[PDB]
RNA sequence: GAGUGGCGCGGACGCUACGCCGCGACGAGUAGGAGGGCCGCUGCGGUGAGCCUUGAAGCCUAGGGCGCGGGCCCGGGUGGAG
RNA sequence: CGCGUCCCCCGCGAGCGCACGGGGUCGGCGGCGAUGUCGGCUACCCACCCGACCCGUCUUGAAACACGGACCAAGGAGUCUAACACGUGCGCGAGUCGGGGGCUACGAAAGCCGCCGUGGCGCAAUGAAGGUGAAGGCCGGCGCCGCCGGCCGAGGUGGGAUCCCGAGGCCUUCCAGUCCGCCGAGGGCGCACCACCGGCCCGUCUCGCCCGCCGCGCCGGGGAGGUGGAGCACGAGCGCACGUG
């Protein structure tokens, strides 16, 4: 679908921060090796 | 020792699209399955048309998809093009349009959807209608391309309205000896 | 999706290995280990992997979960089965058939686990 | 340095490789080369066909009722036959069913 | 834009929308079958006549 | 000799044209030169407009 | 429930068994009917010739409705008209055979290729061996061997030719559906004549094999089949 | 890409796909458009009729600025002024026609090709066709001339 | 992550994500800070490769 | 097809879909055309957690083979850095 | 080879077993087996039998008493550039393209500008040119008028892949009977495209008549019918890459 999930953000220690970004629609753009 | 001419043995249709683009190749897999496992001949034509070259699937403009869907017994029907749907700027009124096309130009999207029309793709067209029941299958003009004006009978040979290959058209670029009775002759 | 990222991986993946009129896939979850839409262990939601245990004897069953499929660490859950040659093959038949978990890989996995059990079984 | 002047030797062999094609047998011949006094008049015959259309939709629809007054007002051996009757699943459906039940 | 929006045709081709309006799979493979002469073979003759 | 149906054209390559070929590998280095000669101009005329 | 669906699937499986056995008895009784026809056909030909000779008059029997045309000469150095007629008779390969019904239109096609064919009026047993052994079917433009009755029935059933014996009947007794039965048969791939040809080049009248052989094609059919 | 070319399939083959009888000789019909009237008369007649000879008046110092007169039709005239005007001038009851300056959009003449949608316009164009006037007047509008 | 493994990048211990880090990685001025980052995010096995 | 009335926890192979499979017919060939090369040479971006002083390239071979073929893979010797 | 029934003369038995039955198996066997034998087609040498002239080339025809070639290694010949045509792949699509310019190790790269889209080709043709420059029927006012109106409206025909409607039909000691699923008598809407008819725009010729008007004439537009055009008739181009010529 055009579903944009909630992509977390990681602190330098390797643990997940409480601040989260909606996956930009760039990442669901058509996968074209051509 | 059999007298068969093997001149006309290898048929020159297409078995697959020359395009290596995956989305169009994933669509072929979906219509290979339908062309054979449905009794429908819609799915035979749509499969055959996905293989075709750019020149063989021309852009059907919006105004034809207005015109060829205003016809009787074509109401509440989905217009299917295997080419593209380009926006025609010199048409004002745009009805509700259930349309399937491989591409639609973003200005035609802008036009069709705002008039409460729905745009599907060929994966959705299969879910809407596997056999293609209640679909208007259209194509744009295939003597559309300006290339076809140069074809046919020889330009310089009588009753030929054929466009000659000239570097540039003026008053002195292929106008005299073949084209006038005043010059050598007129065809 | 599964079918989309196959049409990329099918010819130009790093695991892909072509020589001697043969094609394989050196993926960490391909079992039968051939370049195939069925057995590719990167592509699908559900991925049964069978590997030799980190210890001497036993076979691990690598189960790929439902949730984290964009999550390369929290994805794969591993379970080591150090039992007899019957109820290691049985555990794997029970993990797949009776969970409805990728039942295409029900017999392909048991021929593998058997051949791992056959490998860590000394010579005379 | 004389040469061969002319021949038609290999030509019949060449003409039948794509076939001696008979010309494009199409309906509606063009009105090209028709005498331009006749063609003026036929062009005027098509020009004013609209003139007698209220006469036409009347006359061609009174002949439609004339089909409702004329069609509404209108109204080798024996042994192989009994087998051929039985041996196919439309006319020998119940006939096979009475053979099958007749072993009691 | 996407040329096709759902690319998971694992899901499409076995979804009940398509699965109603197929025809049945003809998976019975038919290999070549030998001829037998009527002079040589009796119970190949009795199959025909 | 012309083959078939095809455009009539007169290629202007009858001179010793290969001696006087101007190749544009200067271009990406020229734009660096023109830019450094434009900033160092503007840095001289310090409060004045740079277009002038 | 499935108490029905077990019993329902058996009844339909039973219904199709008794549908076979009803068709099977028809194929027998149609074949037994033909054994009477061929007896009555064979005997009336002799009968008419006896009541002629008793009177002292002559019984001229009917000019034969059916020929069997075998190609004998090769594919190299053949005239273009003679190429065309051979490939309208479906004789595209040396020692190919096809059944050709005689009329005015077909004998003039069989006289124009007289060097390149060995033709004649075939026997009832000559028709038998060609349709059983060498009998192949043109099903979906594929030379599929006539091994079962449900190949001829599949293609020729609409003309009520539902078995091999119906086809042999349609060939030998040139019926109203001879065209659809003859064109169904693939042109018969006969072997070289076992014993040797007399003289390929010349006509049969001048000690050759090229052209007409009235009852004498049957001597060469068994030589080749 | 040389590997994809034809020369790569002609290694081994002697003539290199240019005939064994008639050798690949340098210029066997002359260089370029040689023999246009002589030995290439048929090519230059069959596909390039009018090539040889003069026609019409020479015009020595011709500039392509004086003869500049680009045309819009009445077909795509409503593309030049935004969608916001066309709906407002249709919706409004006052009968005020929106002015379409054609010189602004880049065109100097309005030709009358298309079917103009039935609401009054004002066209401030430089040149006009007769049919172009009739359609603007027919719908019910003004053909304003401009300099 | 299927295509990134099929590319060949060692991504096996990447904890989750198309990986997004906090904005105090822009503020780094030494490699020892930057190496000890890729240890924690478990992308160091891609440089060890 | 479907409605409503009158004990045993079991079942091989598969399907790189550019794959797999089945049935028929056919296969000369200069000039010439097109296709397919997991044919071959040299550099480049990727990639194989590739190979290599426990011996790279090369070169020789009455060694083992493979491919219809182009060619290639190994064994042995030689060699010294890819 | 039943009975319970419908006329003219006299709807599932229950098993077995053998098999000329949609391409071979044996549930049959016996020998020899460590420095003297076993297999290894291939590859080394050799012999016999049949076949077998020396390649390349131009040529109607070469083993030629045609020419090049004693032998071996290495080198050695359809390239690159511009232009054009067509095919094919990609992107956007009445547009499209920054290619020149400017902005901000690899990087001389890449990213960006839109009041940098000038400009290129495309969207309009035609004429030497001045120029001109691409649908209309009818229905009312003035059996008719220019014209005040008036709703309506990019053709027609024939063939057309597909779609649509469906007279009726597709079963289980059974009868109505709803719902889906599907096929077909027959009927239509008909994409592309082709053939034909119309129309439309420019050039030119014949015909004939009306109109406009700050400027009435060597003015301006209009009409009918033939005819010339590389045109219109609800856009397909542009850029990029590849192939071939």
Curated annotation (Swiss-Prot), chain C:
Keywords: Acetylation, Cytoplasm, Isopeptide bond, Phosphoprotein, Ribonucleoprotein, Ribosomal protein, Ubl conjugation. It comes from the Eukaryota. There is a cross-link at residues 57, 64 (Glycyl lysine isopeptide (Lys-Gly) (interchain with G-Cter in SUMO2)). The modification Phosphoserine is found at residue 114. It is found in: Cytoplasm. GO terms for molecular function: structural constituent of ribosome. Pfam families: Ribosomal_L28e. GO terms for cellular component: cytoplasm; ribonucleoprotein complex; ribosome. One of its GO terms (biological process) is translation. Component of the large ribosomal subunit. The ribosome is a large ribonucleoprotein complex responsible for the synthesis of proteins in the cell. Belongs to the eukaryotic ribosomal protein eL28 family. Component of the large ribosomal subunit. PANTHER family: 60S RIBOSOMAL PROTEIN L28. This is Large ribosomal subunit protein eL28. It comes from Oryctolagus cuniculus. The lineage of its organism: Eukaryota, Metazoa, Chordata, Craniata, Vertebrata. The gene is RPL28.
From Swiss-Prot, chain G:
The keyword Ribonucleoprotein applies. GO terms for molecular function: RNA binding; structural constituent of ribosome. It is found in: Cytoplasm. One of its GO terms (cellular component) is cytosolic large ribosomal subunit. The modification N6-succinyllysine is found at residue 104. Keywords: Acetylation, Cytoplasm, Phosphoprotein, Repeat, Ribonucleoprotein, Ribosomal protein, RNA-binding. GO terms for biological process: maturation of LSU-rRNA from tricistronic rRNA transcript (SSU-rRNA, 5.8S rRNA, LSU-rRNA). CDD domains: Ribosomal_L7_archeal_euk. The keyword Cytoplasm applies. SUPFAM superfamilies: Ribosomal protein L30p/L7e. Pfam families: Ribosomal_L30 (PF00327), Ribosomal_L30_N (PF08079). The modification Phosphotyrosine is found at residue 116. Its main location: cytoplasm. InterPro entries: Ribo_uL30_ferredoxin-like_sf (IPR036919), Ribosomal_uL30 (IPR039699), Ribosomal_uL30_CS (IPR018038), Ribosomal_uL30_euk (IPR005998), Ribosomal_uL30_euk_arc (IPR035808), Ribosomal_uL30_ferredoxin-like (IPR016082), Ribosomal_uL30_N_euk (IPR012988). The modification N6-acetyllysine is found at residue 101. Component of the large ribosomal subunit. The ribosome is a large ribonucleoprotein complex responsible for the synthesis of proteins in the cell. Binds to G-rich structures in 28S rRNA and in mRNAs. Plays a regulatory role in the translation apparatus; inhibits cell-free translation of mRNAs. Belongs to the universal ribosomal protein uL30 family. Component of the large ribosomal subunit. Homodimer. Interacts with DHX33. This is Large ribosomal subunit protein uL30. It comes from Oryctolagus cuniculus (Rabbit). The lineage of its organism: Eukaryota, Metazoa, Chordata, Craniata, Vertebrata. The gene is RPL7.
Curated annotation (Swiss-Prot), chain H:
The modification Phosphoserine is found at residue 67. Signal peptide: none annotated. Hydroxylated on His-38 by MINA. It is found in: Cytoplasm. It holds the Pfam family Ribosomal_L27A. The modification N6-acetyllysine is found at residues 46, 54, 109. Keywords: Acetylation, Cytoplasm, Hydroxylation, Phosphoprotein, Ribonucleoprotein, Ribosomal protein. GO terms for molecular function: structural constituent of ribosome. The modification (3S)-3-hydroxyhistidine is found at residue 38. Coiled coil: none annotated. Residues 1-36 are annotated as: Disordered. It comes from the Eukaryota. Residues 1-29 have a biased composition (Basic residues). GO terms for cellular component: cytosolic large ribosomal subunit. GO terms for biological process: translation. Transmembrane segments: none annotated. Component of the large ribosomal subunit. Belongs to the universal ribosomal protein uL15 family. Component of the large ribosomal subunit. The ribosome is a large ribonucleoprotein complex responsible for the synthesis of proteins in the cell. This is Large ribosomal subunit protein uL15. It comes from Oryctolagus cuniculus (Rabbit).
Curated annotation (Swiss-Prot), chain I:
Citrullinated by PADI4. Coiled coil: none annotated. It is found in: Cytoplasm. Belongs to the universal ribosomal protein uL4 family. Component of the large ribosomal subunit. The ribosome is a large ribonucleoprotein complex responsible for the synthesis of proteins in the cell. Component of the large ribosomal subunit. May bind IPO9 with low affinity. Interacts with RBM3. This is Large ribosomal subunit protein uL4.
